[PDB]
């Protein structure tokens, strides 16, 4: 009944356990609508997707459409004020944030659900009246350069550039889609462009409603949901832009068959095999890439991944379809290499083509295909309720693909067999459509090409006649059988009746010595899961770096072992994570609570019993040494917040410390350690979902009883359970910790200020201070000084202390960072005293609707009561007591902690800073006006820095 309208779609399939409300809609300029209506969801979001991304840049401004992301937050004609967008959603506990693929642009917020109307006016604009200003646009294009400098010493993004360079060079796929400042503003300005018309042009060109899909959700009913947005975007222009295809695959002939040698920055090794396929997406009701990926992708019994690691040849395989644009994919079957296989990277190859052939001669199985779907029907049926930022973004880019009924089900149900699209599939992995990559340091030297974007290092060879002519003659291997049918297959969904004696929170229903059980059957999702989560405590885990390293090779030799067997169990919706720590060692198993039992005891019963193979020793103990030497490859700010966790903590080994312990692991070592580990432990568990309290104890009786009976598990006392502290920084001190990235060319530094122990009080004004000054120090930092492109402030919790971080990864000195960090806070200080009551009490408002914001899954909820149980704080309550405390703070009560705490001349001012000094950088200790900073004690030896000072107490349980 109304002309903006189109049409409105029919009921829109959903999952029965699914309580949100759908209505489905087409405005009259094309631009597809899906509404959902949730009236107890605390935020509300949505989101646009427009079906052109970087593949759709000139050819002459790589990274463009890229660029106009970034731009569009930066104002409107209607609400010109430069950070408009983000203040607000951040005043009204929101968030917003964007991509660019090769075909898809994705804007996304989420806020107070109170607030839906006033950012989703604002979030209109973008695609209505957007600015570009041209102060903004110069500022920018730096924010733009500094995200691909961070990527250019990554591996993945080097290989991801790297692919895209080995194909057609006129082939839209060789562009390099996020651009830096040579592609914005360097070159741009030798050929004589305007890039800020160029921006308006190609948003003007490519931004049209018959290429946009809208999700929004909220509380307001499915009817008021369709006034608002067909208010708001049937007022957007219908330019009828085509939508963009490439039906020429990027790989021609001359692209096939060809093998290429790569030296990686980490210490890695590498075999990508890929083969060009045709566009599958149009049979996505069958799906034949999906069944072919399940079978070579799969990891059990029988597998071709099974067989590579008998050999010792590889460690994990990745198997499917990949996508690529409209027009063409890839498949690619992926394995990281061993010493030993790198040296048969031909012979792997062969396996796979063999396996490949065991498939031919076996044909399509319904069977395999029948149990996919039934798997993803229990999938869907089940879903976990998402976090709306997330789904409206999601399902605002699958929108494009599926009618309006079905983009909820479209990628997860499925209709007929078709063996006939299986077999097409098939016919196209063969070793005459192949390119392989090989990516070593054995390289090194070796090459004689360098990719133009990233710099890497590679070599070009076509693949002899003799090697495809060998693959093409795969002789049987039966090694290879197809998997067995999947007997972890959830088959009870009985939902148990929530007992007369059931808790709200977590119940502690077991003490004993050996272990203490929490307790709570679900009351709030009533899905057929269940999270099992247990702390083992042993003080032989974290002792001494040797112990640490053993601990940790002990329980990736228990996986690498159980691995075949979970597999099967982890495709069936029942996930386990196994971790050592410095307590000893954390379980958690998660998902249907059907077989649940069945697969813990396997683990428990594999842990108490396990018998080490030399071989996997071996090579799992060779990738753990590259693993700890590959740390120098990180990111200068995550270098930062490593020295700065190290610094902090009472106990800490580092990363030198554990890999020279490491050479002194042995077999006999070890074999020793775990049952001296296990001897002594006590179990601390949280048991969450669809159980009962008998069933709760049971389980936990079974762990113990196992332990027992195989490794004679005994108690520790309650003196031997206290945890570690953190350093306790002087009044009035200031410390700086210097070292230097040898990869990166970024510095990085992390600035603590370190307020007090953890308490309500504590807790809120650092929080409130960090919500009111959160949006600005992204905006002076960022926006306007351009420091970098990661520019973090927030709240630091560790060992139950507290205080204020600042995180920036930069090409600016760190001494430079601090004066710009200090200046911002003497900025603040202004602008808080400048505030208005209103403003104040907004930030009040916007913080404790975050802090209340249900969880809309069980393991969330699972999430917040085991953060109580682990820093054995127990404050199930925490959110409502200090959401209490909170509404009572003056905007005086923010400025006295300021000046007491933060301030530069504050009397209990503690800072810490760790300085990360880029690759090529040098030593240094020490616009808005910078403040006179006091000299700083220079760390020399985190040994001695610990030595010198007190440690804190530990947070007293509730
Ligand atoms: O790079 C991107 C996504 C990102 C880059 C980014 C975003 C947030 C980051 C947060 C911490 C460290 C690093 C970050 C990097 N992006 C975000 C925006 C708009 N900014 C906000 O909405 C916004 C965020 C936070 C606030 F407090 C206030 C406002 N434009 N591009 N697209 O190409
Ligand atoms: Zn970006």
Do not use: C
């Not at 604009?125 to 961070?150: G, I, M």
């Not at 006392?717 to 945890?723: A, K």
């Not at 240094?924 to 030595?947: D, W």
Request: proline share 6%; charged share 25%; no cysteine.
């Amino acid at each position: 009944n109304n002309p903006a309208i189109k049409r409105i779609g029919n009921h829109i399939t959903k999952s029965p356990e699914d309580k949100r409300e759908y209505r489905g809609l087409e405005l009259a300029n094309g631009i597809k609508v899906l509404l959902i209506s949730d009236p107890t969801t605390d935020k509300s979001s949505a989101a646009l997707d427009v079906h052109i991304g970087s593949l759709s840049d000139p050819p002459n401004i790589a990274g463009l459409s890229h660029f106009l992301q970034h731009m569009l937050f930066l104002g409107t004609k209607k609400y010109p004020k430069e950070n408009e967008y983000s203040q607000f959603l951040s005043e009204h506990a929101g968030s917003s944030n964007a991509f660019t693929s090769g075909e898809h642009t994705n804007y996304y917020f989420d806020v107070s659900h109170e607030h839906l109307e006033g950012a989703l006016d604002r979030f209109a604009q973008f695609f209505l009246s957007p600015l570009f200003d041209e102060s903004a646009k110069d500022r920018e294009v730096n924010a733009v350069d500094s995200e691909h400098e961070k990527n250019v010493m990554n591996d993945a993004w080097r290989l991801f550039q790297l692919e895209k360079a080995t194909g057609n060079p006129k082939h839209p796929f060789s562009k390099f889609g996020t651009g830096n400042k040579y592609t914005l503003e360097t070159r741009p300005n030798q050929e004589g462009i305007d890039v800020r018309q160029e921006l308006l042009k190609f948003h003007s060109a490519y931004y049209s409603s018959n290429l946009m899909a809208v999700v929004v959700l909220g509380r307001e009913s499915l009817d008021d949901l369709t006034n608002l947005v067909v208010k708001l975007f049937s007022e957007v222009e219908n330019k009828n832009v085509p939508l963009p295809e490439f039906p020429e695959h990027p790989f021609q002939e001359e692209h096939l068959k060809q093998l290429y040698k790569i030296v990686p920055i980490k210490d890695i090794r590498n075999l990508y095999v890929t083969f060009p396929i045709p566009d599958l997406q149009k049979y996505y009701k069958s799906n034949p890439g999906h069944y072919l990926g399940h079978l070579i992708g799969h990891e059990g019994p029988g597998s071709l991944l099974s067989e590579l690691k008998s050999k010792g040849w590889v460690n994990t395989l990745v198997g499917g379809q990949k996508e690529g644009a409209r027009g063409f994919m890839f498949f690619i079957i992926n394995v990281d290499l061993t010493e030993e296989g790198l040296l048969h990277v031909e012979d792997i190859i062969l396996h796979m083509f063999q396996y490949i052939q065991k498939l031919r001669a076996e044909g399509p199985q319904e069977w395999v295909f029948q149990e996919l779907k039934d798997l993803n029907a229990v999938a869907f049926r089940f879903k976990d309720k998402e976090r709306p930022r997330g789904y409206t973004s999601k399902i605002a880019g699958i929108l494009h693909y599926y009618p309006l009924e079905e983009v909820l089900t479209a990628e997860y149900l499925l209709e007929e067999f078709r063996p006939d699209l299986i077999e097409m599939v098939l016919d196209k992995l063969r070793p005459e459509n192949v390119r392989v990559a090989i990516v070593s340091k054995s390289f090194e030297g070796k090459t004689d090409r360098t990719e133009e974007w990233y710099g890497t290092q590679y070599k070009q060879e076509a693949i002899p006649d003799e090697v495809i002519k060998k693959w093409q003659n795969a002789d049987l291997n039966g090694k290879f059988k197809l998997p067995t049918k999947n007997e972890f297959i959830p088959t009870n969904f009985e939902i148990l009746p929530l007992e007369k004696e059931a808790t709200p929170y977590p119940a502690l229903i077991k003490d004993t010595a050996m272990s203490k059980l929490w307790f709570k059957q679900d009351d709030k999702f009533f899905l057929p899961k269940a999270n099992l989560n247990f702390e083992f405590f042993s003080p032989f885990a974290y002792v001494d770096p040797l112990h640490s390293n053993m601990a940790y090779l002990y329980l990736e030799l228990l996986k690498d072992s159980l691995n075949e067997y979970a597999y099967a169990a982890e495709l069936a919706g029942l996930s386990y994570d196994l971790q050592n720590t410095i307590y000893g060692m954390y379980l958690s198993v998660k998902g249907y609570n059907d077989k649940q039992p069945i697969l813990l005891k396997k683990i428990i019963e594999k842990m108490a019993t396990f018998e080490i193979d030399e071989k996997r020793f071996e090579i799992i103990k060779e990738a753990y040494m590259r693993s700890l030497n590959n740390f120098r490859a990180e990111q200068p700010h995550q270098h930062a917040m490593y020295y700065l966790r190290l610094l902090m903590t009472e106990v800490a080994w580092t990363k030198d410390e554990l890999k020279e312990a490491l050479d002194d692991v042995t077999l006999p070592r070890l074999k020793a350690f775990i049952p001296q580990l296990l001897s002594r432990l006590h179990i601390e568990a949280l048991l969450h979902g669809n159980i009962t309290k008998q069933a709760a104890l049971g389980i936990m009786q079974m762990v113990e009883d196992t332990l027992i009976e195989h490794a004679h598990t005994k108690p520790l006392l309650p003196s031997q359970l206290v945890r570690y502290r953190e350093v306790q920084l002087p009044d009035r001190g200031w410390f700086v910790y210097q070292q230097r990235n040898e990869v990166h060319n970024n510095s990085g530094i992390e600035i603590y200020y370190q307020t007090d122990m953890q308490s309500t009080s504590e807790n809120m004004f650092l929080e409130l201070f960090a919500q009111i000054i959160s949006e600005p120090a992204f905006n002076t930092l960022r926006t306007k000084e351009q420091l970098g492109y990661i520019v973090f402030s927030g709240p630091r919790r560790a060992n139950g202390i507290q205080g204020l971080r600042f995180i920036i990864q930069s090409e600016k000195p760190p001494h430079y960072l601090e004066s710009r960090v200090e200046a911002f806070l003497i900025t603040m200080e202004k602008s808080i005293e400048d505030m208005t009551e209103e403003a104040f009490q907004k930030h009040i408002q916007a913080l404790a609707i975050r802090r209340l914001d249900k969880p809309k899954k069980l393991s969330a909820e699972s999430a917040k009561y085991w953060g109580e149980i682990i820093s054995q704080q127990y404050n199930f309550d925490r959110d409502n007591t200090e959401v209490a405390y909170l509404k009572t703070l003056t905007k005086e009560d923010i400025i006295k902690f300021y000046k007491e705490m933060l301030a530069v001349d504050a009397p209990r001012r503690h800072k810490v800073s760790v300085h990360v000094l880029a690759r090529e950088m040098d030593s240094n200790p020490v616009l808005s006006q910078a403040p006179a900073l006091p000299q700083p004690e220079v760390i020399q030896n985190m040994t001695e820095f610990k030595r010198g000072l007190p440690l804190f107490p530990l947070v007293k349980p509730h």
